[PDB]
Amino acid sequence: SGAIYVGNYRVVNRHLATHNDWANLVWEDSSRDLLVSSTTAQGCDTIARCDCQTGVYYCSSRRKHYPVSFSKPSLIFVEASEYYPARYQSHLMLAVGHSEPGDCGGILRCQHGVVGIVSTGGNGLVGFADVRDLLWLDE
Ligand SMILES: CSc1ccccc1N(C)C(=O)N1CCC[C@H](C(N)=O)C1
Ligand SMILES: [Zn+2]
């Protein structure tokens, strides 16, 4: 679980969006596993605008923040789960790190701010949904 709170926006994994989220929708993309809903109060997260490939992510299944190197946002095969059929997920970055289902929503941050949120994983892999291209989150 977890979200990004920037301006009057709440950014969550689309597969974990609550009933309150769909009733206040701004934008969603199934192929990216992202959903953005509107908020009444202003949030304080800053979105990174960079091409960093090193950062720190929060892993709820270990209660630890880990430093990682991560790939550039790409179209990557994601196996079928209870939330999506087998498909390519776009704008996804992989790192070598622990993750389990339950860790989705953990923030990945670099020196410039929020880069993305945990969205997928594997044996010793963790995947993050990038948000650095969503320039409109700033305005
Ligand atoms: C952190 S998720 C995880 C971690 C280790 C191992 C497996 C997973 N699973 C199952 C995973 O990748 N998911 C389930 C949630 C939806 C994901 C998606 N964006 O399509 C696919
Ligand atoms: Zn950066």
PDB file of C-alpha atoms and ligand atoms in Angstrom:
ATOM      1  CA  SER A   1       0.000   0.000   0.000  1.00  0.00           C
ATOM      2  CA  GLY A   2       1.008   3.660  -0.494  1.00  0.00           C
ATOM      3  CA  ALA A   3       0.429   6.859  -2.458  1.00  0.00           C
ATOM      4  CA  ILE A   4       2.101  10.083  -3.758  1.00  0.00           C
ATOM      5  CA  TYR A   5       0.416  13.379  -2.624  1.00  0.00           C
ATOM      6  CA  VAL A   6       1.413  16.302  -4.951  1.00  0.00           C
ATOM      7  CA  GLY A   7      -0.757  19.462  -5.147  1.00  0.00           C
ATOM      8  CA  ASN A   8      -4.414  18.417  -5.287  1.00  0.00           C
ATOM      9  CA  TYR A   9      -3.514  14.924  -6.633  1.00  0.00           C
ATOM     10  CA  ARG A  10      -3.274  11.399  -5.070  1.00  0.00           C
ATOM     11  CA  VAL A  11      -1.235   8.950  -7.215  1.00  0.00           C
ATOM     12  CA  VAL A  12      -1.794   5.269  -6.421  1.00  0.00           C
ATOM     13  CA  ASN A  13      -1.358   1.863  -8.101  1.00  0.00           C
ATOM     14  CA  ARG A  14      -4.491   1.445 -10.302  1.00  0.00           C
ATOM     15  CA  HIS A  15      -4.988  -2.145  -9.007  1.00  0.00           C
ATOM     16  CA  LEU A  16      -5.175  -0.847  -5.370  1.00  0.00           C
ATOM     17  CA  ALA A  17      -7.409   2.235  -6.058  1.00  0.00           C
ATOM     18  CA  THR A  18     -10.217   2.360  -3.394  1.00  0.00           C
ATOM     19  CA  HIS A  19     -13.892   3.151  -4.016  1.00  0.00           C
ATOM     20  CA  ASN A  20     -13.277   6.839  -2.981  1.00  0.00           C
ATOM     21  CA  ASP A  21     -10.521   7.040  -5.787  1.00  0.00           C
ATOM     22  CA  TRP A  22     -12.780   6.013  -8.708  1.00  0.00           C
ATOM     23  CA  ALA A  23     -15.466   8.450  -7.470  1.00  0.00           C
ATOM     24  CA  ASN A  24     -12.896  11.335  -7.862  1.00  0.00           C
ATOM     25  CA  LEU A  25     -10.849  10.239 -10.978  1.00  0.00           C
ATOM     26  CA  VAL A  26      -8.402  12.578 -12.856  1.00  0.00           C
ATOM     27  CA  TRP A  27      -6.499  10.082 -15.096  1.00  0.00           C
ATOM     28  CA  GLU A  28      -5.790   6.336 -15.223  1.00  0.00           C
ATOM     29  CA  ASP A  29      -3.718   4.095 -17.453  1.00  0.00           C
ATOM     30  CA  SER A  30      -4.145   0.298 -17.029  1.00  0.00           C
ATOM     31  CA  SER A  31      -0.995  -0.320 -19.124  1.00  0.00           C
ATOM     32  CA  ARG A  32       1.072   1.708 -16.538  1.00  0.00           C
ATOM     33  CA  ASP A  33      -0.783   0.414 -13.369  1.00  0.00           C
ATOM     34  CA  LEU A  34      -1.394   4.097 -12.357  1.00  0.00           C
ATOM     35  CA  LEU A  35      -4.481   6.039 -11.183  1.00  0.00           C
ATOM     36  CA  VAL A  36      -4.590   9.698 -10.139  1.00  0.00           C
ATOM     37  CA  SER A  37      -7.513  11.050  -8.081  1.00  0.00           C
ATOM     38  CA  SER A  38      -8.303  14.608  -6.898  1.00  0.00           C
ATOM     39  CA  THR A  39      -7.845  15.655  -3.251  1.00  0.00           C
ATOM     40  CA  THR A  40      -9.398  18.423  -1.142  1.00  0.00           C
ATOM     41  CA  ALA A  41      -6.158  19.259   0.688  1.00  0.00           C
ATOM     42  CA  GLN A  42      -2.801  20.163  -0.895  1.00  0.00           C
ATOM     43  CA  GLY A  43       0.028  17.561  -0.759  1.00  0.00           C
ATOM     44  CA  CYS A  44       3.741  18.152  -0.215  1.00  0.00           C
ATOM     45  CA  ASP A  45       5.592  15.585  -2.367  1.00  0.00           C
ATOM     46  CA  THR A  46       7.854  16.982  -5.122  1.00  0.00           C
ATOM     47  CA  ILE A  47       8.060  14.902  -8.344  1.00  0.00           C
ATOM     48  CA  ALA A  48      11.605  14.418  -9.689  1.00  0.00           C
ATOM     49  CA  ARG A  49      12.270  15.797 -13.200  1.00  0.00           C
ATOM     50  CA  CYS A  50      15.505  13.946 -14.164  1.00  0.00           C
ATOM     51  CA  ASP A  51      17.047  10.759 -15.717  1.00  0.00           C
ATOM     52  CA  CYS A  52      18.513   9.376 -12.391  1.00  0.00           C
ATOM     53  CA  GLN A  53      19.063   5.633 -12.254  1.00  0.00           C
ATOM     54  CA  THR A  54      20.004   5.440  -8.525  1.00  0.00           C
ATOM     55  CA  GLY A  55      17.638   6.089  -5.619  1.00  0.00           C
ATOM     56  CA  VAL A  56      16.129   4.714  -2.423  1.00  0.00           C
ATOM     57  CA  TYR A  57      12.832   2.790  -2.145  1.00  0.00           C
ATOM     58  CA  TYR A  58      10.595   1.872   0.781  1.00  0.00           C
ATOM     59  CA  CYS A  59      10.022  -1.906   1.254  1.00  0.00           C
ATOM     60  CA  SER A  60       7.060  -2.486   3.624  1.00  0.00           C
ATOM     61  CA  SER A  61       7.753  -6.288   3.839  1.00  0.00           C
ATOM     62  CA  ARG A  62      11.124  -5.503   5.470  1.00  0.00           C
ATOM     63  CA  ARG A  63      10.214  -2.127   7.179  1.00  0.00           C
ATOM     64  CA  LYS A  64      13.371  -0.817   5.438  1.00  0.00           C
ATOM     65  CA  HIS A  65      14.453   1.754   2.847  1.00  0.00           C
ATOM     66  CA  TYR A  66      16.983   0.304   0.393  1.00  0.00           C
ATOM     67  CA  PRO A  67      19.411   2.066  -1.934  1.00  0.00           C
ATOM     68  CA  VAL A  68      19.044   0.723  -5.533  1.00  0.00           C
ATOM     69  CA  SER A  69      20.187   1.101  -9.177  1.00  0.00           C
ATOM     70  CA  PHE A  70      17.211   0.914 -11.580  1.00  0.00           C
ATOM     71  CA  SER A  71      16.629   0.606 -15.307  1.00  0.00           C
ATOM     72  CA  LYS A  72      15.179   3.330 -17.601  1.00  0.00           C
ATOM     73  CA  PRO A  73      11.331   3.340 -18.014  1.00  0.00           C
ATOM     74  CA  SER A  74      10.485   0.557 -20.483  1.00  0.00           C
ATOM     75  CA  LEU A  75       7.760  -1.817 -21.825  1.00  0.00           C
ATOM     76  CA  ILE A  76       8.274  -4.987 -19.698  1.00  0.00           C
ATOM     77  CA  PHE A  77       6.429  -8.356 -19.648  1.00  0.00           C
ATOM     78  CA  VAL A  78       4.479  -8.867 -16.462  1.00  0.00           C
ATOM     79  CA  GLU A  79       3.059 -12.304 -15.680  1.00  0.00           C
ATOM     80  CA  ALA A  80      -0.685 -12.788 -15.097  1.00  0.00           C
ATOM     81  CA  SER A  81      -1.826 -11.973 -11.541  1.00  0.00           C
ATOM     82  CA  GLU A  82      -5.221 -11.570  -9.795  1.00  0.00           C
ATOM     83  CA  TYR A  83      -5.242  -7.925 -11.096  1.00  0.00           C
ATOM     84  CA  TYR A  84      -4.215  -8.157 -14.777  1.00  0.00           C
ATOM     85  CA  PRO A  85      -3.845 -10.792 -17.469  1.00  0.00           C
ATOM     86  CA  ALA A  86      -0.279 -11.472 -18.826  1.00  0.00           C
ATOM     87  CA  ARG A  87       0.712  -8.263 -20.635  1.00  0.00           C
ATOM     88  CA  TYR A  88       3.410  -5.650 -21.254  1.00  0.00           C
ATOM     89  CA  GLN A  89       3.371  -2.869 -18.679  1.00  0.00           C
ATOM     90  CA  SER A  90       4.804   0.422 -19.950  1.00  0.00           C
ATOM     91  CA  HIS A  91       6.974   3.022 -18.136  1.00  0.00           C
ATOM     92  CA  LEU A  92       8.292   0.351 -15.773  1.00  0.00           C
ATOM     93  CA  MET A  93      11.813   0.359 -14.201  1.00  0.00           C
ATOM     94  CA  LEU A  94      13.404  -2.758 -12.648  1.00  0.00           C
ATOM     95  CA  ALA A  95      15.909  -3.016  -9.803  1.00  0.00           C
ATOM     96  CA  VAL A  96      17.523  -5.936  -7.932  1.00  0.00           C
ATOM     97  CA  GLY A  97      15.779  -5.793  -4.548  1.00  0.00           C
ATOM     98  CA  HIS A  98      13.274  -7.536  -2.309  1.00  0.00           C
ATOM     99  CA  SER A  99       9.591  -7.083  -2.953  1.00  0.00           C
ATOM    100  CA  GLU A 100       6.412  -9.051  -2.287  1.00  0.00           C
ATOM    101  CA  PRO A 101       2.771  -8.317  -3.122  1.00  0.00           C
ATOM    102  CA  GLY A 102       1.806  -5.924  -0.396  1.00  0.00           C
ATOM    103  CA  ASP A 103       4.842  -3.696  -1.164  1.00  0.00           C
ATOM    104  CA  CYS A 104       3.062  -1.912  -4.085  1.00  0.00           C
ATOM    105  CA  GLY A 105       2.795   1.811  -3.412  1.00  0.00           C
ATOM    106  CA  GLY A 106       6.173   2.204  -1.684  1.00  0.00           C
ATOM    107  CA  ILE A 107       7.956   5.339  -2.894  1.00  0.00           C
ATOM    108  CA  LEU A 108      11.215   5.358  -4.949  1.00  0.00           C
ATOM    109  CA  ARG A 109      13.093   8.671  -4.482  1.00  0.00           C
ATOM    110  CA  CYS A 110      16.256  10.223  -5.880  1.00  0.00           C
ATOM    111  CA  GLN A 111      18.008  13.541  -4.973  1.00  0.00           C
ATOM    112  CA  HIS A 112      15.368  15.415  -7.093  1.00  0.00           C
ATOM    113  CA  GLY A 113      12.244  13.978  -5.432  1.00  0.00           C
ATOM    114  CA  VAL A 114       9.737  11.234  -6.126  1.00  0.00           C
ATOM    115  CA  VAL A 115      10.614   9.028  -9.109  1.00  0.00           C
ATOM    116  CA  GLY A 116       7.832   6.443  -8.864  1.00  0.00           C
ATOM    117  CA  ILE A 117       6.053   3.763  -6.796  1.00  0.00           C
ATOM    118  CA  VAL A 118       6.548  -0.030  -6.438  1.00  0.00           C
ATOM    119  CA  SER A 119       4.227  -1.755  -8.954  1.00  0.00           C
ATOM    120  CA  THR A 120       5.685  -5.261  -9.744  1.00  0.00           C
ATOM    121  CA  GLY A 121       8.311  -7.775  -8.530  1.00  0.00           C
ATOM    122  CA  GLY A 122      10.170 -11.041  -9.091  1.00  0.00           C
ATOM    123  CA  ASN A 123      12.671 -13.361  -7.470  1.00  0.00           C
ATOM    124  CA  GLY A 124      15.063 -10.745  -6.125  1.00  0.00           C
ATOM    125  CA  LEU A 125      13.576  -8.069  -8.443  1.00  0.00           C
ATOM    126  CA  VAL A 126      11.319  -5.059  -7.788  1.00  0.00           C
ATOM    127  CA  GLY A 127       9.636  -2.929 -10.459  1.00  0.00           C
ATOM    128  CA  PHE A 128       8.586   0.743 -10.194  1.00  0.00           C
ATOM    129  CA  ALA A 129       5.969   2.636 -12.148  1.00  0.00           C
ATOM    130  CA  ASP A 130       7.678   5.893 -13.291  1.00  0.00           C
ATOM    131  CA  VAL A 131       5.830   9.228 -12.766  1.00  0.00           C
ATOM    132  CA  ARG A 132       8.660  11.630 -13.915  1.00  0.00           C
ATOM    133  CA  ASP A 133       7.120  12.086 -17.382  1.00  0.00           C
ATOM    134  CA  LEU A 134       3.716  13.240 -15.882  1.00  0.00           C
ATOM    135  CA  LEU A 135       4.657  16.938 -16.159  1.00  0.00           C
ATOM    136  CA  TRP A 136       1.037  17.980 -15.532  1.00  0.00           C
ATOM    137  CA  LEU A 137       1.283  16.768 -11.867  1.00  0.00           C
ATOM    138  CA  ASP A 138       3.277  20.039 -11.198  1.00  0.00           C
ATOM    139  CA  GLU A 139       0.522  22.370 -12.462  1.00  0.00           C
TER     140      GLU A 139
HETATM  141  C1  LIG B   1       5.409  -6.025  -5.740  1.00  0.00           C
HETATM  142  S1  LIG B   1       4.349  -7.157  -6.697  1.00  0.00           S
HETATM  143  C2  LIG B   1       5.228  -8.692  -6.629  1.00  0.00           C
HETATM  144  C3  LIG B   1       6.422  -8.830  -5.930  1.00  0.00           C
HETATM  145  C4  LIG B   1       7.088 -10.047  -5.929  1.00  0.00           C
HETATM  146  C5  LIG B   1       6.572 -11.123  -6.609  1.00  0.00           C
HETATM  147  C6  LIG B   1       5.378 -11.006  -7.299  1.00  0.00           C
HETATM  148  C7  LIG B   1       4.701  -9.788  -7.321  1.00  0.00           C
HETATM  149  N1  LIG B   1       3.535  -9.664  -8.142  1.00  0.00           N
HETATM  150  C8  LIG B   1       2.563 -10.759  -8.092  1.00  0.00           C
HETATM  151  C9  LIG B   1       3.419  -8.715  -9.133  1.00  0.00           C
HETATM  152  O1  LIG B   1       4.399  -8.346  -9.753  1.00  0.00           O
HETATM  153  N2  LIG B   1       2.161  -8.215  -9.409  1.00  0.00           N
HETATM  154  C10 LIG B   1       0.970  -8.242  -8.546  1.00  0.00           C
HETATM  155  C11 LIG B   1       0.323  -6.869  -8.411  1.00  0.00           C
HETATM  156  C12 LIG B   1       0.101  -6.217  -9.777  1.00  0.00           C
HETATM  157  C13 LIG B   1       1.414  -6.180 -10.582  1.00  0.00           C
HETATM  158  C14 LIG B   1       1.239  -5.439 -11.895  1.00  0.00           C
HETATM  159  N3  LIG B   1       1.559  -4.152 -11.879  1.00  0.00           N
HETATM  160  O2  LIG B   1       0.862  -6.027 -12.916  1.00  0.00           O
HETATM  161  C15 LIG B   1       1.942  -7.613 -10.730  1.00  0.00           C
HETATM  162 ZN    ZN B   2      16.792  12.461  -9.942  1.00  0.00          ZN
END
